[PDB]
Amino acid sequence: DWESREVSTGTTIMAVQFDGGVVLGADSRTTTGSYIANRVTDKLTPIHDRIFCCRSGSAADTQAVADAVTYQLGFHSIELNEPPLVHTAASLFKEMCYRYREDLMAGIIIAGWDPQEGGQVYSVPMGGMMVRQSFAIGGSGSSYIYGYVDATYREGMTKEECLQFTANALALAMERDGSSGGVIRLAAIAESGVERQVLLGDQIPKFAVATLPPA
Amino acid sequence: KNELLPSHPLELSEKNFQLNQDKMNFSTLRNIQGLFAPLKLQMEFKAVQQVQRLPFLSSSNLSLDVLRGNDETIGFEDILNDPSQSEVMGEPHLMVEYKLGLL
Amino acid sequence: MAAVSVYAPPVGGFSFDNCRRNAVLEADFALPKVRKTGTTIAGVVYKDGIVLGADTRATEGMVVADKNCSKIHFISPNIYCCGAGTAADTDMTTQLISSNLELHSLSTGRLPRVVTANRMLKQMLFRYQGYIGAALVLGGVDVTGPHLYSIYPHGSTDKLPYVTMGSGSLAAMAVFEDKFRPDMEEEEAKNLVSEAIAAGIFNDLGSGSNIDLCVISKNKLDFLRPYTVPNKKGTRLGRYRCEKGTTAVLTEKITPLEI
Amino acid sequence: TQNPMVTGTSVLGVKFEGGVVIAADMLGSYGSLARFRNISRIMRVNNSTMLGASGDYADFQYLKQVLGQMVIDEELLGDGHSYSPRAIHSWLTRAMYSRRSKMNPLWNTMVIGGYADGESFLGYVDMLGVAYEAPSLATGYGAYLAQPLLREVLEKQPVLSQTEARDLVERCMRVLYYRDARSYNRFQIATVTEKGVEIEGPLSTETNWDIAHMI
Amino acid sequence: IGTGYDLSASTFSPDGRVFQVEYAMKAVENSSTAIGIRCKDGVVFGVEKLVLSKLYEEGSNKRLFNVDRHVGMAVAGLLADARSLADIAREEASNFRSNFGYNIPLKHLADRVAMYVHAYTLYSAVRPFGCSFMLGSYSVNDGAQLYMIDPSGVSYGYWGCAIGKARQAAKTEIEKLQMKEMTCRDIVKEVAKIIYIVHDEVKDKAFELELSWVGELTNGRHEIVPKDIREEAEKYAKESLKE
Amino acid sequence: RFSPYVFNGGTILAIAGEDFAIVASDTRLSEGFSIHTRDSPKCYKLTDKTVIGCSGFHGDCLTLTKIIEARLKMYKHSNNKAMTTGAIAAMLSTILYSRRFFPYYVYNIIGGLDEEGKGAVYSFDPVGSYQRDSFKAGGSASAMLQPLLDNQVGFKNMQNVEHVPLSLDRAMRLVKDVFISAAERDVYTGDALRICIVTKEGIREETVSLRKD
Amino acid sequence: MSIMSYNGGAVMAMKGKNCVAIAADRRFGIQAQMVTTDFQKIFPMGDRLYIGLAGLATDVQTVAQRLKFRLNLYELKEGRQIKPYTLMSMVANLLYEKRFGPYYTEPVIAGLDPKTFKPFICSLDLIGCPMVTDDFVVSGTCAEQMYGMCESLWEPNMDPDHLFETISQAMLNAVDRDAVSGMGVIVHIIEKDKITTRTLKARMD
Amino acid sequence: MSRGSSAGFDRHITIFSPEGRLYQVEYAFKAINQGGLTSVAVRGKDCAVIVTQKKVPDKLLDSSTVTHLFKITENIGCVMTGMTADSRSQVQRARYEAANWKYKYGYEIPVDMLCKRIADISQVYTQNAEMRPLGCCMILIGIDEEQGPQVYKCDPAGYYCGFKATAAGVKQTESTSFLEKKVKKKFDWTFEQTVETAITCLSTVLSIDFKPSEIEVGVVTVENPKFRILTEAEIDAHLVALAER
Amino acid sequence: SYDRAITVFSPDGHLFQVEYAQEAVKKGSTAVGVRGRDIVVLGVEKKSVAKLQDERTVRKICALDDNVCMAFAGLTADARIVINRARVECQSHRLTVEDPVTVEYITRYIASLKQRYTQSNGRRPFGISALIVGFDFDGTPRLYQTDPSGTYHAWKANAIGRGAKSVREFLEKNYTDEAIETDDLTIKLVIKALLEVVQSGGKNIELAVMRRDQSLKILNPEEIEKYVAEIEKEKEEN
Solving technique for this entry?
cryo-EM
CB contact under 8 A, D75 and E94: no
* CB-CB contact of E86 with E73 (8 Å): yes
Asked if B7's CB is within 8 angstroms of G101's CB, the reply is yes
Query: For residue C233, what are the contacts with CB-CB under 8 A and spacing of at least 6?
Result: none
Domains of chain H, first to last: 2-245 (3.60.20.10)
How far is H21 from F55, CA to CA, in rounded Å? 77
Strands H148-154 and G194-200: unpaired
Chain centre to alpha carbon of residue A178: 18
Instruction: With both helix axes pointing from N to C terminus, report the angle between I164-173 and I183-197 in degrees, rounded to the nearest 10.
Output: 140
Identify the bridge partners of residue F130 per DSSP, sorted by sequence position.
F124
Residues of B within 8 A of C16 (CB-CB) are 6-8, 10-11, 14-15
Could you tell me if residue C106 is inside a domain? Answer: yes
Question: What is the Rg, in whole angstroms, of the alpha carbon atoms belonging to chain B?
Answer: 16
Chain A contact partners (≥3 CB pairs within 8 A): B, C, D, E, H
Residue G33 lies in domain: 2-205
B37 and H128 in contact by Cβ < 8 A? no
Nearest CA distance, B44 vs chain G (angstrom): 31
Q: Which distant-in-sequence residues (6+ apart) come within 8 Å of D176 by Cβ?
A: D9, D10, D12, D25, D141, D142, D145, D146, D183
Helix H111-127 / helix C87-108 crossing angle, nearest 10 deg:
90
Let me know if E199 is exposed, middle or buried by CB neighbors in 10 A (0-12, 13-18, 19+): buried
Q: Do chains D and A touch (3 or more CB pairs under 8 A)?
A: yes
Compute the residue count for chain D: 215
For D36, which DSSP code? B
How big is chain G by its Cα radius of gyration, in Å?
16
In a domain, C255, yes or no: no
Chains D and B touch (3+ CB pairs under 8 A): no
Residue contact A91–E99, C-beta within 8 A: yes
Domain that holds residue F125: 1-213
How is residue A145 annotated by DSSP?
A: G
Nearest residue of chain B to residue H97 (CA atoms): B69
The one-letter amino acid code at H13 reads I
User: How many domains, chain G?
Assistant: 1
**Contacts of range E105-109, beta carbons closer than 8 Å, 24 or more positions apart:** E105/A80, E105/E139, E105/E142, E105/E145, E106/E71, E106/E135, E106/E136, E106/E137, E106/E139, E106/E142, E106/E145, E106/E147, E107/E145, E107/E147, E107/E155, E107/E157, E107/H65, E108/A79, E108/A80, E109/E67, E109/E68, E109/E71, E109/E135
Min Cα separation D138/chain F (Å): 9
How many Å is the maximal CA-CA distance in chain F? 57
Chain B residue numbers with beta carbons less than 8 Å from the beta carbon of H92 are: 33, 37
Which CATH number fits the domain I1-238, given the four candidates 3.40.309.10, 3.20.20.10, 3.30.420.40, 3.60.20.10?
3.60.20.10
Which residue in the list D1, D93, D163, D191 is annotated as catalytic? D1
The CB-based long-range contact list for G4-8 (8 Å cut-off, 24+ gap) reads G4/C32, G4/G54, G4/G55, G4/G56, G4/G104, G4/G140, G4/G141, G5/G141, G5/G180, G6/C25, G6/G30, G6/G31, G6/G56, G7/G55, G7/G56, G7/G57, G7/G180, G8/G140, G8/G141, G8/G178, G8/G180, G8/G181
Provide the domain limits for residue A194. Answer: 11-212
Give the one of E5, E122, E153 whose C-beta lies nearest to H131's C-beta.
Answer: E122
DSSP 8-state symbol, F68: H
- In whole angstroms, give the CA distance from residue I158 to residue I164: 8
Tell me if there are at least 3 CB pairs under 8 Å linking chains A and G. Answer: no
Please report the resolution in angstroms. 2.8
Beta bridge partners of C136: C83, C151
CB contact under 8 A, B79 and G73: no
Tell me the fold of E1-240. Glutamine Phosphoribosylpyrophosphate, subunit 1, domain 1 (3.60.20)
Mapped onto helix, strand or coil, the DSSP state of residue G119 is strand
Domains in chain E: boundaries: 1-240
**C-alpha span between A61 and D207 (Å, rounded):** 45
Q: Put the strands of the sheet holding H148-154 in their side by side order.
A: H69-71, H77-82, H136-144, H148-154
Q: How remote is the C-alpha of H188 from its chain's centroid?
A: 24
Other residues' Cβ atoms within 10 Å of the Cβ of residue E64: 24
Catalytic residue among C37, C39, C93, C94: C39
Report H helices in chain C.
Answer: 19-28, 87-108, 114-127, 169-178, 186-203
Contact of B96 with chain C, judged by CB distance below 8 Å, is answered with no
Q: Do chains A and H touch (3 or more CB pairs under 8 A)?
A: yes
Specify the amino acid at residue I205. I
Query: Chain C residues with CB inside 8 Å of G101's CB?
Result: 15-19, 21-22
Q: CA-CA distance, G174 to G141, in Å (whole number)? A: 10
CATH number at residue A76: 3.60.20.10
SS (H, E, C) chain H: CCCCCCCCHHHCCCCCCCCCCCHHHHHHHHHHHHCCCEEEEEECCCEEEEEEECCCCCCCECCCCCCCEEECCCCCEEEEEECHHHHHHHHHHHHHHHHHHHHHHCCCCCHHHHHHHHHHHHHHHHHCCCCCCCCEEEEEEEEECCCEEEEEEECCCCCCCECCEEEEECCHHHHHHHHHHHHHCCCCCCHHHHHHHHHHHHHHHHCCCCCHHHEEEEEEECCCCCCEECCHHHHHHHHHHHHHC
Q: Is C14 on the interface with B (CB under 8 A)?
A: yes
What are the phi and psi torsion angles at G56 (to 5°)?
-60, 130
Q: Determine how many CB atoms are found less than 10 A away from the CB of residue F186.
A: 21
> At E239, phi and psi to the nearest 5?
-65, -45
Nearest to B93 among I81, I120, I122 (CB): I81
**What are φ and ψ of residue D23, in 5° steps?**
-140, 145
The residues in H 118-177 lying below 8 A from B, measured between CB atoms, are 120-121, 123-124, 127-131
CB contact (8 A) between residue A6 and residue C154: yes
Collapse the DSSP code of G180 into the 3-class scheme (helix H, G, I; strand E, B; otherwise coil) and give the result: coil
| Residue C257 domain-assigned (yes or no) | no
Instruction: Check which CATH number belongs to the domain holding G80 and give it.
Output: 3.60.20.10
Beta-carbon count within 10 A of C222 CB: 15
From the candidates A9, A11, A31, A166, give the one annotated as an active-site residue. Answer: A11
Neighbour subunits, B (≥3 Cβ pairs < 8 A)? A, C, E, G, H, I
CATH of residue F105's domain is: 3.60.20.10
Nearest-Cα distance to chain A for D106, in Å, is 12
Residue G43 sits at the vertex; the CA angle it makes with G39 and G44, to the nearest 5 degrees, is 145
What's the domain range around C53?
Answer: 40-228
**In whole angstroms, what is the distance from residue B48 CA to residue B57 CA?**
16
Q: Contact, I131 vs I160, CB < 8 A?
A: yes
Residues of B in contact with C1 (CB under 8 A): 89-90
Distances (CA, A) of E179 to E14, E137, E175, E211, H60: 42, 16, 9, 17, 10
Q: How crowded is residue A159: how many other Cβ atoms within 10 Å of its Cβ?
A: 18
The answer to whether H99 faces chain A, any CB pair under 8 Å, is yes
- B78 with C16: Cβ contact below 8 A: no
**I151 in contact with chain B, both atoms CB, cutoff 8 A:** no
What span, in angstroms and rounded, lies between the C-alpha atoms of D171 and D147?
Answer: 11
E147 chain-H contacts, CB cut-off 8 A: 65
Chain H neighbors of A74, CB-CB under 8 A: 99, 102
- Residue of chain F whose alpha carbon sits nearest to that of D97: F59
User: G190 by DSSP, 3-state: which?
Assistant: strand
Q: Is CATH 3.60.20.10 what the domain over D1-215 is classified as, yes or no? A: yes
Judge whether A41 counts as a catalytic residue.
no
To the nearest whole angstrom, how far is the Cα of A8 from the nearest Cα of chain D? 19
| Torsion from C-alpha of G51, G52, G55, G56, nearest 10 degrees | 60
H114 touches chain A (CB under 8 A): no
How far apart are the C-alpha atoms of H240 and I22, rounded to whole Å?
86
Query: Which of D128, D145, D150, D156 should be substituted to probe chain F, the one whose Cβ sees the most F Cβ atoms within 10 Å?
Result: D128
| Residues of B whose CB is below 8 A from E122 | 40
Closest residue of chain A to H71, computed from CA coordinates: A78
Of the candidates A80, A95, A116, the beta carbon closest to that of E108 is on A80
